[PDB]
Amino acid sequence: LLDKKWLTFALAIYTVFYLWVRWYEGVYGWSAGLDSFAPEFETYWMNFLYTEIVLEIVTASILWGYLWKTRDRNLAALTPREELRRNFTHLVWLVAYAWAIYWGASYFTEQDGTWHQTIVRDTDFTPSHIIEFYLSYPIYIITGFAAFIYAKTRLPFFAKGISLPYLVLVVGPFMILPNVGLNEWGHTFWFMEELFVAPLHYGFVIFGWLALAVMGTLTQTFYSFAQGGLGQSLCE
Amino acid sequence: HGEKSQAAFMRMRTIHWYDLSWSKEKVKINETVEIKGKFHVFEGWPETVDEPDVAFLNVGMPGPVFIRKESYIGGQLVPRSVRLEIGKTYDFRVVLKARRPGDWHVHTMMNVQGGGPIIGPGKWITVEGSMSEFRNPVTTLTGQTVDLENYNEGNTYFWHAFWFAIGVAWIGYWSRRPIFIPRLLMVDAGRADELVSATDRKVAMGFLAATILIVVMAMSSANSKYPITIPLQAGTMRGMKPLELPAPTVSVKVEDATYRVPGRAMRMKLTITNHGNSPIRLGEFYTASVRFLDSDVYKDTTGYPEDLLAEDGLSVSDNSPLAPGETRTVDVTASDAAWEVYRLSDIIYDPDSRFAGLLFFFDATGNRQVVQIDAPLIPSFM
Amino acid sequence: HGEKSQAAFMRMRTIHWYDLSWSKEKVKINETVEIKGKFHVFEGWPETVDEPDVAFLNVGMPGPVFIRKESYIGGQLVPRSVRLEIGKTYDFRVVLKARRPGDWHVHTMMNVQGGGPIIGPGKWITVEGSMSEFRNPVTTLTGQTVDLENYNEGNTYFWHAFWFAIGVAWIGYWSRRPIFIPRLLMVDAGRADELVSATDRKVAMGFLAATILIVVMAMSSANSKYPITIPLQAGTMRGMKPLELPAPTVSVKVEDATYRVPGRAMRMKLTITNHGNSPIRLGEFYTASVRFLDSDVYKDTTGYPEDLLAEDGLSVSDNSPLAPGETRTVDVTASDAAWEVYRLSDIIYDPDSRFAGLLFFFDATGNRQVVQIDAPLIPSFM
Ligand SMILES: CCCCCCCCCCCC(=O)OC[C@H](COP(=O)(O)OCC[N+](C)(C)C)OC(=O)CCCCCCCCCCC
Ligand SMILES: CCCCCCCCCCCC(=O)OC[C@H](COP(=O)(O)OCC[N+](C)(C)C)OC(=O)CCCCCCCCCCC
Ligand SMILES: CCCCCCCCCCCC(=O)OC[C@H](COP(=O)(O)OCC[N+](C)(C)C)OC(=O)CCCCCCCCCCC
Ligand SMILES: CCCCCCCCCC(=O)OC[C@H](COP(=O)(O)OCC[N+](C)(C)C)OC(=O)CCCCCCCCC
Ligand SMILES: CCCCCCCCCC(=O)OC[C@H](COP(=O)(O)OCC[N+](C)(C)C)OC(=O)CCCCCCCCC
């Protein structure tokens, strides 16, 4: 069996959900979403913010708790074939993390640009502020934490210790979410120019750099893949 | 749509927009709508806002639903940032061409280099038609007419696709062979020196030489075509001509100003001294995009936005005609739902509880006088 | 010699030099030459240049071929930086004393704190004699006359040579023994503790004590001699007195201005309104150190530099006398080889294609009027 169709679901769920989110923000961007003090803004974007925050907290708790509770206690008695299957599942988790990272840090972030640089601006919770900071960021954080936990709890290579590159890849992009505080402090007060390359944008960037730890993470996963079932063929 | 969130005192004391007019309220695609009016730069410019040494006359709108055909300060076109003087009154004119159908809230705004957006009154303008009918023709000094909607789009797409294809070809050339794990094992276990061998070096040399040669040839071709080019035209424009307003014949001294918390009314006591030779009457109080009118004295006919217009929102304790030379003190109350809708009541949250505004005084013959008032605004709770 | 490289529009709109005069064209060593004139700070000061809050009246020249004896703005000496006001006209006077023989291109220039050099017209001045004959005497408040060419030179040489000799003595004392490789081997192989032993420590203590004692004694001696000293005198000088020019009786409105690319001519259409009570005629157009003259109206007699002077470079379509109260629109062409020699045609490369200049209008009796014009400058290619 080895690599199964969980990868197709991993791609499709993010693609479909974010396409629907884009449709929603295209429909309610203007017209209930321009005026932050209008009653329709509360029903179409503040309610969205509340619901998405509650659902993200619940989903993160449930997913992380399930992954930690179903952790493999007897990692020693794991066959190489099962280890290969678990390595493929972890690679699917990493693919989902990469897809979520794309959607969060490229698509909806540069949609913050197109939005803040064309709209008259108004609150810390613009519809772009509900979709990017509080939906896509949390979603990729949840996916990254889940992938890290799966590696630690199913892969003997990633067990017996916390991998530094994986921890950086998982936590640095997470630090972008608390960095939103610098954003708010970085437009309201310091810098009223809607520049996206302002130093108040450095906390996100600096922590966007930490995603480069995926390189060490991926060579670690390559070594984990090539533990017992490294071949032969490769180097033979 | 971006105001009602800015600080009330900052909206009150930055820039006062008046004599605003709109040529049309409903337009077709490609039809032009003109916005005119005057703005006065308040003398008590807040220290937190940089002085309007570098300012841009902008339009508040949800993206290019209109295109700014022209914009004027004084009588001269202002496509760049301009320098404004504190205390001066300027007249402006913005010409917009409809591009996208719908109902749009169009604001005239002034962006200041170190203070952010100063949004004036916004008016709903309806656009009907189809976006596909929109044209933005322009004639260059080289004698060709192009449509700015799609000019150079094909060339941009072609060049970007070409370079993306070159990069993808490079990556795929290296990706035909196995990529990650066997190459990693070969590099780790002993010297590799086997995964990069001729003609890989020849292919890379070809890629490098072709890239440099294609860049040079494309630049030369883009220089032979379009032989006449100019850099981007930028730079703040000085010498904006302000309006030479006559000195007002009305002097007003604000003796305290209060507003109820909570409430929708603002109360102030004014000592009005009438100079000149005509009986005056208080007709309007404009504070921040909100016009409180005394309907018995003046009526608005310029189609001011209804949510910003208080037709009878200005009540004067004694608004009888003020004979020349006579001085009297009256209690003026400006009350309207706009005071709470546009969050002018939220000056209680502000770190500077001072207001500014314009009082419009009208005589019998109809000629009007504009006087500016500013004073601390004291909340009242009991 | 540093202009012709600066941006054409920046040379056009910073500072306009006019009424320039030179006392002499050829001088001897120690002889004085005086440069006089007026400069007007343009109202449309470019935003890329900091406002002339801190400005210095300098001389453009290849090193001290002259010494600046005196310099005045208004009527007062300006050895320090000064504050200038935008839109004001100031008169200046620089006194130069010849120091080095040769043919020198002397410019009057204004350095602005945050904008760099603004170079005015330059004139070739011949210096004859020998540099050895040059003297720069000055009398101090302590009652001694010194020559600034060689004053303190001996003392400076002596002290520098003394301290250099002390350092060389230290180095040579340590360099008598073998230096690099044996000492390195001794330090590496085992503890060294043998290459620095008494009386080396005694010699170093002597060097340190002698250095401190000599510094203290020299400072005390230099305080007993020259007991009266003052710090360097610095600081921007405010309150420069501008010229109180009468309000011009001529108003000019520029209706478009064009220049051919390539070409040596600039064309503009002006609407001239003559107020006052005398028939006026356009006699000069000054744009950037270049004077385009209508020879039928005015002739230059102040010895303006020939390469900057267009004697008949100004052609007016109808330069008949303009009766008072009369308004007419004429086509004015300023054409000369200077327009290309001084790269005023390179405004096509500039990111701000706007020009500024001065128009000089002369009546029958000879009294002149100065009016300032500024407008966009549109290139024409076909
Ligand atoms: C990592 C964990 C992430 C957790 C956060 C998830 C956020 C989900 C969206 C919040 C909505 C909100 O809050 O708003 C509630 C909205 C407000 O729209 P309405 O006014 O009712 O109009 C009618 C509804 N339309 C405008 C959508 C037609 O209505 C709803 O009930 C519909 C929400 C549907 C969400 C599920 C579909 C997603 C795409 C399919 C692939 C997954
Ligand atoms: C991973 C992190 C999850 C955290 C979830 C949030 C828990 C909130 C607890 C209640 C706080 C409260 O009610 O008070 C917060 C007060 C509200 O102030 P107010 O509305 O101005 O006035 C007072 C109004 N009261 C009296 C009704 C409260 O201060 C603030 O303005 C802070 C609000 C910003 C919260 C940002 C959370 C973003 C989470 C993103 C998850 C993906
Ligand atoms: C241990 C080390 C930690 C130190 C960090 C503490 C935060 C510093 C707070 C500054 C307050 C101050 O010092 O003054 C506040 C000054 C006062 O200026 P103003 O006159 O109001 O200007 C008016 C201009 N407005 C209207 C736009 C404000 O505003 C500033 O210029 C803010 C400068 C930015 C400093 C924050 C940079 C954070 C770096 C983030 C990159 C990851
Ligand atoms: C609406 C939310 C639905 C999330 C569903 C989570 C599925 C449960 C997670 C999980 O444990 O594994 C699911 C799959 C297949 O891996 P499994 O083998 O089921 O995992 C345990 C491994 N073990 C069987 C050897 C013990 O592993 C995967 O690759 C699933 C990837 C799912 C993409 C991540 C979605 C997260 C959105 C916030
Ligand atoms: C918010 C920012 C995160 C800060 C980063 C700190 C974490 C980084 C290191 C890390 O993840 O290790 C914690 C464990 C991995 O196992 P260990 O650290 O070895 O310890 C396991 C026992 N423990 C679950 C109680 C911790 O991983 C887990 O066990 C996590 C799953 C259990 C938590 C589920 C409850 C959370 C619901 C919200």
Ligand SMILES: CCCCCC(=O)OC[C@H](COP(=O)(O)OCC[N+](C)(C)C)OC(=O)CCCCC
């Ligand atoms: C790899 C990222 C793909 C992002 C594509 C996207 O944002 O799609 C939204 C956009 C919306 O434009 P349109 O297709 O005209 O449909 C408009 C519907 N709304 C306004 C809700 C977006 O176009 C599509 O939906 C095309 C489907 C692409 C599938 C990968």
Ligand SMILES: CCCCCC(=O)OC[C@H](COP(=O)(O)OCC[N+](C)(C)C)OC(=O)CCCCC
């Ligand atoms: C890594 C490079 C960081 C350079 C910081 C920078 O560009 O700051 C520009 C800003 C100059 O402000 P300015 O660009 O004039 O802002 C104009 C808009 N306002 C006045 C509203 C802020 O300077 C500061 O306020 C100090 C920045 C500290 C960085 C750790």
Ligand SMILES: CCCCCCCCCC
């Ligand atoms: C207004 C001048 C701002 C200068 C900022 C310097 C930033 C340097 C970062 C090391």
Ligand SMILES: CCCCCCCCCC
């Ligand atoms: C090393 C490659 C240098 C290429 C220079 C090309 C110059 C062409 C002038 C138009």
Ligand SMILES: CCCCCCCCCC
């Ligand atoms: C440790 C050497 C300090 C020297 C001080 C000398 C003071 C002299 C006063 C004129």
Ligand SMILES: OCCCC(F)(F)F
């Ligand atoms: O994070 C928002 C983008 C730039 C800003 F100007 F709007 F602030």
Ligand SMILES: [Cu+2]
């Ligand atoms: Cu930001």
Ligand SMILES: [Cu+2]
């Ligand atoms: Cu609006």
Ligand SMILES: [Cu+2]
């Ligand atoms: Cu005002």
Ligand SMILES: [Cu+2]
């Ligand atoms: Cu020279």
Ligand SMILES: [Cu+2]
């Ligand atoms: Cu001038």
